[PDB]
Amino acid sequence: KVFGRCELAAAMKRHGLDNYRGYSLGNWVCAAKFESNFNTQATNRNTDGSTDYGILQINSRWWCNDGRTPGSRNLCNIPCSALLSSDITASVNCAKKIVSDGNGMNAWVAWRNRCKGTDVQAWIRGCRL
Ligand SMILES: [Cl-]
Numbered sequence: 001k002v003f004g005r006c007e008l009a010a011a012m013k014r015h016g017l018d019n020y021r022g023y024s025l026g027n028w029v030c031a032a033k034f035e036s037n038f039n040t041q042a043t044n045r046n047t048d049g050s051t052d053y054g055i056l057q058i059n060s061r062w063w064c065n066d067g068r069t070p071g072s073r074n075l076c077n078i079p080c081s082a083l084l085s086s087d088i089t090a091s092v093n094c095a096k097k098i099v100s101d102g103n104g105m106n107a108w109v110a111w112r113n114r115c116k117g118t119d120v121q122a123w124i125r126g127c128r129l
């Protein structure tokens with residue numbers, strides 16, 4: 001499923017991401033835009049043999065099991081395929097673990113390079129929330 005901007009904002013709010021660990025909803029929307037273009041089915045392979053999955057591009061070395069990343073830790077205790085669902089619940093639940101790991105949203109490279117320090121409130125402008 002490819003989300004609309006305001007549709008995604010509303011779903012993220014309902015799942016408790018607005019101000020989760022101090023990050024306003026606009027941060028999460030911006031990160032999803034530049035990680036996956038709002039597409040739940042996005043996958044990208046990395047040089048190390050791991051793959052990133054879903055709307056927030058969660059990595060198979062640490063967070064989910066895809067059966068082909070040797071020494072995966074599977075910290076979210078889920079198959080990576082669960083992160084490609086039209087229902088964002090598994091992606092959100094796993095993202096809450098990631099953002100709590102010490103480095104905050106810097107764990108998402110596109111957030112650090114394209115969202116951090118910008119007017120992220122713009123990503124939720126005009127939405128009925
Ligand atoms: Cl932080």
Ligand SMILES: [Cs+]
Pocket residue numbers: 073074075077
């Ligand atoms: Cs585990």
